[PDB]
Amino acid sequence: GFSNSNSSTVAIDHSLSLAGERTWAETMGLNTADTARLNANIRYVNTGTAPI
Amino acid sequence: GFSNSNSSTVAIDHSLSLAGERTWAETMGLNTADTARLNANIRYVNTGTAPI
């Protein structure tokens, strides 16, 4: 048997898409030369004999 | 044999997608003119004879 065939398919598509996104982000910047700041709590004591 | 034919396919799709993402990032900024800061620890010595 010898069979001959020829087809032609014509198509079309429509589409929707609803994309909802919630993004959480956190960042911690630092400078190695200026990491900390200081503060002293100090008093002055006179154990002498004359005031200054 | 002589066969004609004719088809028509009608289709529809619905879809969901749940995309969860965790992103890690790291950054190191630098300025070539201001790379380093200095600090000296020094003392003063008097080997002389009069005070100053």
Which residue type, as a one-letter code, is found at position B51? P
CA–CA separation, B32 vs A50, rounded Å?
55
Within an 8 Å CB–CB cutoff, is residue A19 touching chain B? yes
The alpha helices in A1-52, defined as continuous H runs, are none
CA–CA separation, A27 vs A1, rounded Å?
74
CA–CA separation, A10 vs B10, rounded Å?
12
Residues with Cβ < 8 Å from B23, sequence gap 6 or more?
A: A25
Mutation for testing the A interface, residue in B14, B15, B24 having most A CBs under 10 Å: B15
Please report the resolution in angstroms.
4.6
Show residues of chain A in contact with B18, CB under 8 Å: none
Chain center to CA of A24: 7
Q: How far apart, in Å, are the Cα atoms of A45 and each of A20, A39, B21?
A: 67, 19, 61
Selecting from A17, A19, A33 the residue whose C-beta is nearest the C-beta of B37 gives: A33
Say which experimental method was used. Answer: cryo-EM
Which positions 30-49 of B are in contact with A (Cβ < 8 Å)?
Answer: 37
Q: Which two tokens stand for residue A15?
A: 């589409």
State the Cα angle at A11 between A5 and A16, rounded to 5°: 155
CB atoms within 10 A of CB A40: 4
CA–CA separation, B51 vs A36, rounded Å?
39
